[PDB]
Enzyme design. Structure first.
Site, mmCIF file in Angstrom:
data_model
loop_
_atom_site.group_PDB
_atom_site.id
_atom_site.type_symbol
_atom_site.label_atom_id
_atom_site.label_comp_id
_atom_site.label_asym_id
_atom_site.label_seq_id
_atom_site.Cartn_x
_atom_site.Cartn_y
_atom_site.Cartn_z
ATOM 1 C CG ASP A 30 -2.554 24.976 -15.072
ATOM 2 O OD1 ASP A 30 -2.350 24.916 -13.841
ATOM 3 O OD2 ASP A 30 -1.799 24.449 -15.912
ATOM 4 C CG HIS B 113 2.690 22.328 -17.553
ATOM 5 N ND1 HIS B 113 1.469 22.059 -18.132
ATOM 6 C CD2 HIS B 113 2.427 23.022 -16.422
ATOM 7 C CE1 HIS B 113 0.508 22.576 -17.388
ATOM 8 N NE2 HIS B 113 1.064 23.167 -16.346
ATOM 9 C CG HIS C 274 4.554 27.515 -18.209
ATOM 10 N ND1 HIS C 274 5.485 27.267 -17.223
ATOM 11 C CD2 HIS C 274 3.777 28.523 -17.746
ATOM 12 C CE1 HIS C 274 5.279 28.086 -16.208
ATOM 13 N NE2 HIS C 274 4.248 28.859 -16.499
ATOM 14 C CG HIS D 62 0.943 28.319 -14.434
ATOM 15 N ND1 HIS D 62 2.215 27.938 -14.799
ATOM 16 C CD2 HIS D 62 0.198 27.190 -14.425
ATOM 17 C CE1 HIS D 62 2.239 26.634 -15.006
ATOM 18 N NE2 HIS D 62 1.027 26.157 -14.787
HETATM 19 K K LIG Z 1 -2.622 21.277 -16.145
HETATM 20 ZN ZN LIG Z 2 0.025 24.143 -14.675
#
Ligand SMILES: [K+]
Ligand SMILES: [Zn+2]
Ligand SMILES: [K+]
Ligand SMILES: [K+]
Ligand SMILES: [K+]
Ligand SMILES: [Zn+2]
Ligand SMILES: [Zn+2]
Ligand SMILES: [Zn+2]
Lengths: 389, 394, 389, 394
Positions: B176, B259, B262, B277
């Site tokens: 992340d 993201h 994602h 995540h």
């Molecule tokens: K991030």
């Molecule tokens: Zn994130």
């Protein structure tokens, strides 16, 4: 002050900067208050810009208690102001210089209310800090939390005499130097614990931003134009310097600055950043940087119209006895210089203050640099002349 | 509701505290917001692991503590039930645990106009410090981003708890954290509004850089440290990068394609629900690299780094080697929804371009593995909360 | 002198440098004597600082024999001084300039006693050496061991005319150049064997330290402040240069320096380092460095106020015959120039001395450099004017 | 008793002499301190190997030599017995051999107010030139550092003796020499008092650099040379680095965490008694690197160098793979004792941090071995005086 072994980062909840931002006060103030707010400012600030904030809040249904700051941040005067704040006050908004800002923080803290700090010049990095100088300097007072919002209207900032911005650059210049010394000495940060990496990079951001934009911001300020370069330095002088020093720490530069007041005389005419800049050069001598590196920083200060000699500071005849006094004050037990791993005695402080003067004079001679900072009539006076080319 | 402005804005929690055994010093920090009454929220697992350390500290200092158990379900119905269990004289809401618990704490605190204290028990994402709350249907599908007017007041991390957690969690946080610099640079260079609501500050950009630099220097040493169960400064540096730096770096900068991708991937479902995540974000970051048209050598430098950290860089590792073109087009459509962060990029895309880039990453990574003879592979565990199937320690 | 095929490093047992160090004499002197010591100094040094050492020793129970150096380091005068040293003398302490220091070493050696050398200026690197110039130069005398302790009080050093420090910088500047030439020629070191790597790095330390701090030390000295930069150069001029040359070796520079005395006339007014600096430039011509590299060193010397021309040296009209004489003296069988693998004849030495003069004059012209070294009335006279900016 | 000052101090032996067959030229140097009578101290092994060469030289030149045999036991009782065997007209004490013999010589010489001549017969540590004397209980456990007012007068080394010794000894000296730059830089940058008693000189810092630079250029060539039994200039350079440079570099600079960790390790006992000083110091230096928080790449550069020199970089190689956390905490406590050199560092530590760093080094080194496919390993011999179990020559 509370010390800890944990890694700590501290900061205001919000930092907002923009031209004519005061006309958009409510959209930001509403995050802490939508019913009642106190706006504190001295009469001069009320005459010049504080009503812009009031108008925004009132147009949005808020009750605004307008208080006039007497000009003296004394406990007696502060208590009187608190007593004028309505019982349902939701936030304390301070507009103006350091005394007004510190007064707002004090009153907000006393009433357990959030605070909004609105600097009218970019002359120091005190705006975002949780500390208030207690004064001749005595010690630093640390509030448990930082002001909630630092609100800056750059249209107001750009209209102020460029001497103010330059003083701010002088203060911002010390951030990287002092914070690096604190971090490399593995000393507790001004945040109360081990220095974070984030804080170190913000101090770096300050350094890099001044290097790239300090002179263009100065030229912009003088011309009265709000360029992005000017806005960058406003951010460096306020946000970056503020977070960079509090999450890092103060060292010799600021302790020396506090020591200078011990001289009095014409010293009272210097702005904070003007003294801090010279103090930073003094720390450089104490850190034993090669002369070439000293010159690189001194030349930068000179280009920004900051004083780099005792003559420019207005105390070319300061005596050895007086300097020893500055040295003793600089080394008081609670001063920040003690964060440095290298230790000093009063004579070393005195010697370094004189060494800066000689080094700078040599640089001026070698380069043929003719520009000189001339100490104005008073601390709040603009430059004697226009520094614009 | 998110509000944009023309002003330069920086946003942050009031305090970020990180240290080993820090929870045993809870009152010292909590006292800044509450000295009389506090609510401590955590699922049963976290209560068993460390939540009581916090309660004990506050109690030993004269505070009344309302101990609530998160039902694991971050539903509005369950959240409102929790709020009703909070005394009227409650001064602060303390959330201890993972994302669901942290978001539930922020919601309740906001609902009661009270300050919040967030205590992550793993360093698997940078959600801790943010004013955001990911909203997803009960199926897991991402819906939109909810913004709070202010950031949580204190992010409190006990690194003894962090170092004891399975290293897969730290790696997810690295994944992340790796997207932060990439996405924020993309938002800033596109001159788009930041996630703070205005023009991006220089400070935020440098914090994003701090994140990138710290991971480059310490990511692998933190991984080895976590695996060996030792709380080295290197490990602590990455905890800061994964939490504080990545957090302030993304919110003051912004999210972009990574993201959004994602979120689109979650629409694939199947084994994708077992991915953490950061594992998905890392792959999504490589996809953004393809969309940004980085020369292959630069893609390889990032993919190789991810591989060394044990992050999946191929569809095979993600557990969906047979994903169909139609499913990828579905991801592309989800990725490009109006509210998605990918629109912050100046370069615009259509679904087929997203689908193509997802497959391109797979081929690029497979080529890199072949060229370098890299044999290490991420193998998807039984659930998103499970440790690695095997010990990655040398 | 005893030559060997072994790798040899030599040095004093202790080197101590600090401001007001003489007030702490006993804590160091006690390592060699706790009962009786002789302190040798000329009347001027006794009047100015030698009693500080005596007071420290006496306050700590020691008997101190105070001897006044006549000013002439002759065998007859030295014998007379030895005869004044009590039978139970444990150490010989010399305070002052080169003649006093060499006298102390001689007497200590004659009595088989340890020696403590306390320079009152930082004008040469002779303090730590085991050799004493025998004079017109004739040859070098090598004691079997180095003085035991070199004791430097920087408060005394900083009070001396800056011309002394500059002379010392001139001497220190030759160390790297000469030692490198000796090492690269694979010639026996002044320590008696193959040059050690350690010695080479100390010569490097000297070079690097002067590059970074020479000018700031000069400015510091002129201002009368004992900055760390000043202390760094004091160390470079004394410890680094001393160990760097003895463990390395002398070459053309010093041989040329000895050759200059053959001229007499105004030459007697130059300090050792002032002549050595010019001699170093001469070695650079002999080593055939490209003109740009010559300029880099000449410019540095010029910035340090060292003479780089025959005019500044005070002998602008020296004749070819006189220069040939310098050349012959420079090439005497026992001179250090023979350590260089490259060999020369008298006319080449003469030609190089003139070439330096022309090269330097061209550099002054090209750069517009106006500063000039003006030869004072005598060898011990301060600068004619203040070099401070 | 050690005495600190505010002055800048440099300390050194009066002479350092190194050369092949140098002992056959003993009088030439010894005559500087004694021309009539001298004591030569060495254990039986050294007498058989080279001590007689020194005696012969002095004898052939008219000197009376008192030949004493070190009982191998450096006890005050044994030392005083030796002193009583020294004639009243003795002008100098000559110690020939290893650390115990060298320290016994310094003690006796100091006790008689006489100059000392130290002749190391191996280049396994930098103790030769120092004014220090390691004091340890009969169990081997380190107690404290004893300081003499002056350094030994002459360090005399015959490189023919050095090149004939098992290369494991030279490698141990390289391990000790490697910590010099690391520790001294740490003491200097922390602005702590030097081991010379005052502010660190610039000269000492450059000698430490000379040590680092020389090892980088010649360590492996010296190792190969020693193994092949040839006294090349490269070999001679490392003898100088291991003895003169490392010696002056550490004493004029200072010791820090590395040596403190070495002292703590001895408390583990077990097979640890079979490790040579430098073998332990090298590992301790890597531990200091972890405590100093160097990025992993920089740790790898040093660990790889140590590995190439055949120094142990893992707990397995040290012979204590099963060392317990409690034992490591014990080492941490020993490392942090009030008199330890680790306190010269500006960064402060607790026992758990020391223990964690020791394990971190092990994991970091194991990862490096895996990544690079490095197969060479240090295998602990039967005793600390034994040669390698196998020939390391290619
Ligand atoms: K991030
Ligand atoms: Zn994130
Ligand atoms: K500052
Ligand atoms: K010299
Ligand atoms: K060492
Ligand atoms: Zn300031
Ligand atoms: Zn000289
Ligand atoms: Zn050692």
């Amino acid at each position: 002050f509370e010390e800890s072994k944990d890694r700590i980062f501290t900061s205001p909840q919000k930092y907002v900067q923009g031209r004519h931002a005061f006309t958009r006060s409510y959209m930001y103030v509403k995050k802490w208050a939508t019913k009642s707010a106190v706006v504190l400012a001295d009469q001069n600030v009320w005459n010049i810009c504080a009503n812009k904030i009031v108008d925004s809040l009132s147009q949005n249904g808020m009750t605004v208690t307008k208080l006039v700051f007497g000009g003296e941040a004394s406990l007696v005067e502060l208590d009187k102001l608190r007593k004028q704040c309505p019982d349902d006050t939701q936030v304390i908004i301070g507009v103006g210089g350091g005394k007004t800002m510190d007064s707002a923080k004090y009153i907000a803290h006393s009433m357990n209310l959030p605070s909004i700090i609105c600097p009218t010049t970019a002359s120091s990095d005190a705006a975002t800090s949780s500390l208030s100088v207690i004064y001749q300097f005595q010690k630093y007072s640390f509030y448990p939390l930082n002001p909630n919002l630092i609100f800056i209207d750059t249209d107001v900032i750009v209209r102020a005499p460029v001497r103010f911005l330059i003083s701010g650059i002088g203060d911002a210049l010390s951030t990287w130097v002092e914070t690096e010394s604190v971090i490399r000495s593995n000393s507790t940060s001004f945040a109360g614990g081990v220095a974070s990496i984030a804080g170190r990079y913000i101090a770096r951001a300050c350094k890099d931003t001044l290097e790239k934009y300090a002179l263009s911001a100065i030229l912009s300020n003088t011309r009265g134009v709000c360029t992005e370069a000017f806005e960058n330095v406003v951010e460096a002088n306020t946000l970056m310097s503020g977070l960079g020093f509090e999450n890092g720490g103060l060292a010799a530069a600021h302790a020396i600055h506090n020591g200078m007041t011990a001289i009095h005389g014409p010293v009272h005419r210097l702005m904070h950043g003007e003294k801090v800049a010279y103090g930073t050069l003094v720390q450089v001598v104490l850190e034993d940087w090669p002369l070439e590196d000293f010159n690189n920083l001194a030349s930068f200060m000179a280009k920004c119209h900051l004083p780099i000699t005792l003559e420019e500071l207005g105390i070319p005849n300061v005596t050895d006895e007086e300097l020893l006094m500055v040295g003793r004050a600089t080394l008081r037990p609670d001063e920040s210089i003690h964060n440095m791993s290298k230790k000093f005695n009063p004579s070393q402080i005195a010697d370094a203050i004189k060494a800066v003067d000689s080094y700078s004079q040599k640089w001026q001679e070698q380069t043929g640099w003719t520009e000189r900072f001339r100490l104005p009539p008073s601390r709040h006076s603009p430059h004697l002349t226009d520094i614009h080319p």
